[PDB]
Amino acid sequence: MIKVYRYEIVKPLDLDWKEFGTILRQLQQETRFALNKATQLAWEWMGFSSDYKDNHGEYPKSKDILGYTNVHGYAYHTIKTKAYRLNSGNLSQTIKRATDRFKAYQKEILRGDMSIPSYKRDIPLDLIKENISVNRMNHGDYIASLSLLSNPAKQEMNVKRKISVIIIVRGAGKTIMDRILSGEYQVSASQIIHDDRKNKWYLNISYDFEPQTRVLDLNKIMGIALGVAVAVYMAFQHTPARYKLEGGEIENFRRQVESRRISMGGHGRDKRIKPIEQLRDKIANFRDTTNHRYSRYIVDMAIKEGCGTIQMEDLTNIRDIGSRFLQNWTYYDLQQKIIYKAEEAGIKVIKIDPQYTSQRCSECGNIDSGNRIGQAIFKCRACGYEANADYNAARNIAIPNIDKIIA
Amino acid sequence: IKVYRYEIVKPLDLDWKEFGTILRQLQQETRFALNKATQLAWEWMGFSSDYKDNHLGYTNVHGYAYHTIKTKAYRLNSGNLSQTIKRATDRFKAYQKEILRGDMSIPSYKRDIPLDLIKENISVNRMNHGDYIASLSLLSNPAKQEMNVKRKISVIIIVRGAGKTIMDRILSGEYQVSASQIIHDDRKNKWYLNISYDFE
DNA sequence: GCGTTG
DNA sequence: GGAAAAACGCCAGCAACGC
RNA sequence: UCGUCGGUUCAGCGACGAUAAGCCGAGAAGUGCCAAUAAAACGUGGUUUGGUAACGCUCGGUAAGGUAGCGCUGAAACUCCGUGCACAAAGACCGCACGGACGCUUGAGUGUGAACCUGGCGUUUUUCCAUAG
């Protein structure tokens, strides 16, 4: 597996902040140039190869026309003249990302289902894993030394070695960095990113790690239902334990940003929109934090009951997902967090068809549309089953092949 | 100079399977001309590479692209093909500096493409019975001598309520029909007609 | 340790 | 209609050799 | 009430700012506006150049924690005490380690609480206004 942790850059060691910021903005401009020109050169090679097969009879060899096995090798040779300030391994990784995205999606681009990808202004800075080195000092500082410049750029900017910055390593980042420095974790290709709200630069480190091996019974399954009266309900077949998440904080935040959006010149488009994007980024960050909390609770309640399989709904064909509690949520974000945290815990996630799953009684299996009589309570007809509707739904999810059993 | 769309229920002298096949063929040629005009605008503006030039009586990129494209895009009407190639070349010329600077990649065009229609190829008519006929000149002569479509394609358009004020001033003489498009909606499977109109 | 190409 | 925003969706997260 | 700093996100707490849903610059890529000039394509069509500053025109500025003064001493941000190590202005310093005492969570972990897999690209609808039934 591989995860990402960010660290705040305090200051460069031998530079000033003004020179360091100028260098970072210039390398951002060069990264954006390299991405967009590698996309243009890959598109031009696609068109040339189509015209070559039309005029000759076969596809042209890239090694004969361009001089290179890959179009990445030609794009490096072209882009390297105007992107001379980037470190050449970082430039090679950037062009590799651009040409790999164009190569993986070439049939979708030729069919017209996907656009040709354009790249934006505030772009992250790539760093291959040989260009990162972190060291802890005796007085408690952490120095990250980064190869960011080429050999001409180091001479034109009067830099002699790698650029060393001080990073803050606190909290869980202390644990990650201590496992990096002892060899237990392995650094992958990483980023320099920027945060406009706090005006902060970050080293975004991608690390390879081997997760903890547990013993979990694959035959025990936990079912998760997106309730209409509580937010998430979790149930089991082999045990009458039931867990739930209700949104008290969700209901509070949902009208504390609705009571604030009741009231809501001549200097461009970026004014007249600056105070509303604060509220929008606040809402996005709240949803991200809430989905992380919910995902950790759902995977923790499956570690607790020894389950080796998680089953939840499939939301691609519902279209009335606004009738649930959460009500407009980022459900895809929550489910992806469920998936990676369960894969890290050792649990299989199986999405199932939510065919009816709320009219079926979960004790015998009779499906009647008049079963739920007020959106919180559940009454059966064939066995007189008395239950909560979300718990009955979550217990119907936890059956191993319930989507074939219903239909 | 504003737009109003009008949903098409049916063609008069055709069924919804012949007319749909004709529109999908026209969409394929429209997308071909849009992509090829972007390639030829890339070649015309310099911009290319060494490996292509190491391998003309035209004033502008529009004429060179038109005379190159019109052989393979022969099923489209000639004014409609000219209006399509103008859209692609003007999109390339409005974005040429960012394409050169590397602030943008190549302009691209989607599969469910609109079909262009110059104002010489759009007609509307009310009768005494109450329906609304839109007459559309969509094919060329080598296409009309092969699909055996005899006249302009006449379809019935839903003109209700808000657009009914818009259409009548078209038939009065007060509004002038500008260049329009035939568009498609995939989720509804619904063909619309984006009539553009003028007022001064 | 950067640079170039598979 | 216009002009944007946001939910949904997918995948990566280089390697080997030469100066 | 909204915001700034206290490692990241959400909340709290401490200290601050606020007419900040404010105030001001420069510039000219675009939508207008004003001048001329008018190609490709089939009379229709709308071309090319310059100016102008109205613009959800373009690029930016503008408030917000605290810190010891004679080459040594060591002050100051989210519990206290001790011993070390490091530090004279700071977008950059207010930290780190070990030992203990007090708590907290479930003998360990912990020190305000919970959490901490991101980045890039694409798609398609939904908002929000304007508009008319």
mmCIF file of N, CA, C and O (backbone and C1' of nucleotides) in Angstrom, chain B residues 77-80 117-123 135-138 152 177-180, chain E residues 40-45:
data_model
loop_
_atom_site.group_PDB
_atom_site.id
_atom_site.type_symbol
_atom_site.label_atom_id
_atom_site.label_comp_id
_atom_site.label_asym_id
_atom_site.label_seq_id
_atom_site.Cartn_x
_atom_site.Cartn_y
_atom_site.Cartn_z
ATOM 1 N N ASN B 77 -23.843 19.681 -46.146
ATOM 2 C CA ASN B 77 -24.075 20.853 -46.976
ATOM 3 C C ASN B 77 -22.851 21.762 -46.913
ATOM 4 O O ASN B 77 -22.158 21.818 -45.895
ATOM 5 N N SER B 78 -22.567 22.455 -48.020
ATOM 6 C CA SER B 78 -21.296 23.164 -48.152
ATOM 7 C C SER B 78 -21.218 24.390 -47.248
ATOM 8 O O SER B 78 -20.165 24.651 -46.653
ATOM 9 N N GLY B 79 -22.314 25.143 -47.125
ATOM 10 C CA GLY B 79 -22.351 26.242 -46.178
ATOM 11 C C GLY B 79 -22.295 25.813 -44.732
ATOM 12 O O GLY B 79 -21.680 26.503 -43.915
ATOM 13 N N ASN B 80 -22.893 24.665 -44.406
ATOM 14 C CA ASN B 80 -22.799 24.118 -43.060
ATOM 15 C C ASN B 80 -21.389 23.645 -42.737
ATOM 16 O O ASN B 80 -20.919 23.836 -41.609
ATOM 17 N N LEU B 117 -26.031 25.144 -38.974
ATOM 18 C CA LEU B 117 -27.006 25.471 -40.011
ATOM 19 C C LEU B 117 -26.934 26.970 -40.258
ATOM 20 O O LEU B 117 -27.301 27.754 -39.379
ATOM 21 N N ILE B 118 -26.482 27.371 -41.447
ATOM 22 C CA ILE B 118 -26.501 28.789 -41.779
ATOM 23 C C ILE B 118 -27.932 29.228 -42.075
ATOM 24 O O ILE B 118 -28.828 28.413 -42.318
ATOM 25 N N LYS B 119 -28.147 30.548 -42.057
ATOM 26 C CA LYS B 119 -29.497 31.107 -42.125
ATOM 27 C C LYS B 119 -30.161 30.920 -43.486
ATOM 28 O O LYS B 119 -31.374 31.122 -43.598
ATOM 29 N N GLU B 120 -29.402 30.536 -44.514
ATOM 30 C CA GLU B 120 -29.974 30.163 -45.799
ATOM 31 C C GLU B 120 -30.571 28.761 -45.794
ATOM 32 O O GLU B 120 -31.208 28.374 -46.778
ATOM 33 N N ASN B 121 -30.373 27.988 -44.723
ATOM 34 C CA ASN B 121 -30.775 26.588 -44.677
ATOM 35 C C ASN B 121 -31.797 26.313 -43.582
ATOM 36 O O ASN B 121 -31.998 25.157 -43.203
ATOM 37 N N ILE B 122 -32.429 27.355 -43.046
ATOM 38 C CA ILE B 122 -33.420 27.233 -41.981
ATOM 39 C C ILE B 122 -34.686 27.933 -42.453
ATOM 40 O O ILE B 122 -34.634 29.098 -42.863
ATOM 41 N N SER B 123 -35.816 27.239 -42.388
ATOM 42 C CA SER B 123 -37.104 27.842 -42.697
ATOM 43 C C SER B 123 -38.117 27.393 -41.658
ATOM 44 O O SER B 123 -38.012 26.287 -41.129
ATOM 45 N N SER B 135 -38.091 23.570 -41.888
ATOM 46 C CA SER B 135 -37.478 23.004 -43.080
ATOM 47 C C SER B 135 -35.975 23.220 -43.003
ATOM 48 O O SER B 135 -35.512 24.355 -42.839
ATOM 49 N N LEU B 136 -35.221 22.132 -43.119
ATOM 50 C CA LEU B 136 -33.796 22.104 -42.834
ATOM 51 C C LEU B 136 -33.069 21.565 -44.057
ATOM 52 O O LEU B 136 -33.374 20.462 -44.526
ATOM 53 N N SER B 137 -32.117 22.337 -44.572
ATOM 54 C CA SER B 137 -31.255 21.889 -45.664
ATOM 55 C C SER B 137 -29.967 21.363 -45.045
ATOM 56 O O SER B 137 -29.080 22.132 -44.677
ATOM 57 N N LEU B 138 -29.861 20.041 -44.940
ATOM 58 C CA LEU B 138 -28.807 19.406 -44.173
ATOM 59 C C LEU B 138 -27.830 18.594 -45.003
ATOM 60 O O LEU B 138 -26.741 18.287 -44.511
ATOM 61 N N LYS B 152 -35.872 19.389 -48.942
ATOM 62 C CA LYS B 152 -35.342 19.698 -47.625
ATOM 63 C C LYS B 152 -36.084 18.877 -46.578
ATOM 64 O O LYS B 152 -37.254 18.529 -46.750
ATOM 65 N N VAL B 177 -33.813 35.158 -38.582
ATOM 66 C CA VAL B 177 -33.163 33.939 -38.125
ATOM 67 C C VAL B 177 -31.669 34.045 -38.386
ATOM 68 O O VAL B 177 -31.236 34.309 -39.515
ATOM 69 N N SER B 178 -30.874 33.862 -37.339
ATOM 70 C CA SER B 178 -29.430 33.824 -37.477
ATOM 71 C C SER B 178 -29.007 32.368 -37.674
ATOM 72 O O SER B 178 -29.834 31.496 -37.941
ATOM 73 N N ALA B 179 -27.709 32.093 -37.569
ATOM 74 C CA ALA B 179 -27.223 30.728 -37.712
ATOM 75 C C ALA B 179 -27.637 29.899 -36.505
ATOM 76 O O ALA B 179 -27.528 30.353 -35.363
ATOM 77 N N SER B 180 -28.122 28.689 -36.758
ATOM 78 C CA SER B 180 -28.674 27.826 -35.722
ATOM 79 C C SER B 180 -27.944 26.486 -35.696
ATOM 80 O O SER B 180 -27.009 26.243 -36.461
ATOM 81 P P A E 40 -12.120 36.385 -50.719
ATOM 82 O "O5'" A E 40 -12.259 35.002 -49.953
ATOM 83 C "C5'" A E 40 -11.120 34.258 -49.564
ATOM 84 C "C4'" A E 40 -11.468 33.259 -48.497
ATOM 85 C "C3'" A E 40 -12.564 32.266 -48.834
ATOM 86 O "O3'" A E 40 -12.128 31.205 -49.665
ATOM 87 C "C1'" A E 40 -12.902 33.095 -46.658
ATOM 88 P P A E 41 -13.126 30.547 -50.736
ATOM 89 O "O5'" A E 41 -14.461 30.248 -49.924
ATOM 90 C "C5'" A E 41 -14.659 29.009 -49.257
ATOM 91 C "C4'" A E 41 -16.051 28.900 -48.694
ATOM 92 C "C3'" A E 41 -17.166 28.912 -49.717
ATOM 93 O "O3'" A E 41 -17.381 27.649 -50.310
ATOM 94 C "C1'" A E 41 -17.677 30.432 -47.996
ATOM 95 P P C E 42 -17.830 27.553 -51.842
ATOM 96 O "O5'" C E 42 -19.387 27.854 -51.796
ATOM 97 C "C5'" C E 42 -20.279 27.015 -51.078
ATOM 98 C "C4'" C E 42 -21.604 27.693 -50.838
ATOM 99 C "C3'" C E 42 -22.376 28.125 -52.073
ATOM 100 O "O3'" C E 42 -23.069 27.067 -52.715
ATOM 101 C "C1'" C E 42 -22.369 29.880 -50.492
ATOM 102 P P G E 43 -26.038 43.843 -54.905
ATOM 103 O "O5'" G E 43 -27.260 43.161 -54.146
ATOM 104 C "C5'" G E 43 -27.207 42.953 -52.743
ATOM 105 C "C4'" G E 43 -27.714 41.584 -52.360
ATOM 106 C "C3'" G E 43 -27.243 41.052 -51.018
ATOM 107 O "O3'" G E 43 -27.999 41.568 -49.938
ATOM 108 C "C1'" G E 43 -27.046 39.362 -52.665
ATOM 109 P P U E 44 -27.319 41.801 -48.503
ATOM 110 O "O5'" U E 44 -27.055 40.331 -47.957
ATOM 111 C "C5'" U E 44 -28.142 39.516 -47.553
ATOM 112 C "C4'" U E 44 -27.721 38.094 -47.287
ATOM 113 C "C3'" U E 44 -26.727 37.878 -46.166
ATOM 114 O "O3'" U E 44 -27.324 37.926 -44.885
ATOM 115 C "C1'" U E 44 -26.118 36.568 -48.031
ATOM 116 P P G E 45 -26.603 38.687 -43.668
ATOM 117 O "O5'" G E 45 -25.210 37.938 -43.503
ATOM 118 C "C5'" G E 45 -25.137 36.615 -42.997
ATOM 119 C "C4'" G E 45 -23.785 36.012 -43.266
ATOM 120 C "C3'" G E 45 -22.632 36.680 -42.550
ATOM 121 O "O3'" G E 45 -22.488 36.187 -41.235
ATOM 122 C "C1'" G E 45 -22.069 36.333 -44.825
#
